[PDB]
Amino acid sequence: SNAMSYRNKTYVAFASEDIKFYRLMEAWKANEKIDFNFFDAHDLFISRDTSKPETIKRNLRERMKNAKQVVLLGSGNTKRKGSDGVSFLAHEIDLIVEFNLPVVIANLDGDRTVDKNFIPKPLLDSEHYTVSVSFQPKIIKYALDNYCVNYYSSSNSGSYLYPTSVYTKLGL
Ligand SMILES: [Br-]
Ligand SMILES: [Br-]
Ligand SMILES: [Br-]
């Protein structure tokens, strides 16, 4: 219950408006359409009515210290909330930048390119190396297995995509 699997390395961050897409991701795990585990902090968001903001902030920092990599669900709500300096997602994004974690942006409209209008401004301003992929299980896992593993050794900076051959070879 409080013990965490070593294989559960991936934190998923999203704007509260986009919870439907996260639930879809949770369906994929329960129905084994995905081949990776992940965790999140939506429980802390839910408990905001019974918790003071300073308590939520400390609990969130604590939660994110266990992440090795991030899947960021990308939409216009991601950019707005993630750039506004006050929202729950804005605090997540600040920690994600501070902890220098790799980020896979999964574009919720299926865009297989970089859409900077889905990426929060602090993450763009950090110039950290990121990759943007469609919101599809197999490309997300490919990014976790490749980009995220290579993040620290790479000399690249800023926003990348995966070329069409990667999607083709995955049967997408
Ligand atoms: Br776990
Ligand atoms: Br939010
Ligand atoms: Br496309």
Numbering used by the authors: -2 to 169
Quote the paper:
The Thoeris defense system triggers abortive infection (Abi) upon phage detection. The ThsB genes encode Toll/interleukin-1 receptor (TIR) domain–containing proteins responsible for phage detection, while the ThsA gene encodes an Abi-triggering effector protein. Two ThsA effector variants have been reported: a silent information regulator (SIR2) and SMF/DprA-LOG (SLOG) domain–containing effector (ThsASIR2-SLOG) and a transmembrane (TM) and macro domain–containing effector protein (ThsATM-macro). Collectively, our biochemical and structural data demonstrate that the nucleotide signaling requirements for ThsASIR2-SLOG and ThsATM-macro effectors are distinct and suggest that ThsATM-macro effectors can trigger Abi via membrane perturbation by a mechanism that involves nucleotide-induced oligomerization of its macro domain.
The Thoeris defense system in E. coli CFT073 consists of a TM-macro ThsA effector (EcThsA) and two TIR domain–containing ThsB proteins (EcThsB1 and EcThsB2). To identify the nucleotide products generated by ThsB proteins of Thoeris systems with a TM-macro ThsA effector, we expressed and purified the TIR domains of EcThsB1 (EcThsB1TIR) and EcThsB2. We did not detect NADase activity for EcThsB2, but its crystal structure revealed a unique active site configuration with a tyrosine residue within hydrogen bonding distance to the catalytic glutamate residue. Furthermore, AlphaFold2 modeling reveal that many ThsB proteins (subfamilies 7 to 9) found in Thoeris systems with a ThsATM-macro effector have an active site configuration closely related to the NDT family of enzymes, which catalyze base-exchange reactions between the purine or pyrimidine bases of 2′-deoxyribonucleosides and free pyrimidine or purine bases. Our structural data suggest that EcThsB2 may be autoregulated, in this case, by a short C-terminal extension that binds to a surface region shown to be important for TIR domain self-association and active site formation in SARM1 and AbTir. To test whether this tail affects ThsB activation, we generated two variants of EcThsB2: a modified tail with Y159 and Y164 replaced by alanines (EcThsB2Y159A, Y164A) and a tail deletion (EcThsB2Δ151–169). The single ThsB protein of BaThs has a tyrosine containing active site and a predicted structure (UniProt/AlphaFold Database: A0A806QQ11) similar to EcThsB2 and ThsB subfamily 9 members, suggesting that this class of ThsB proteins produces histidine adenine dinucleotide as an immune signaling molecule.
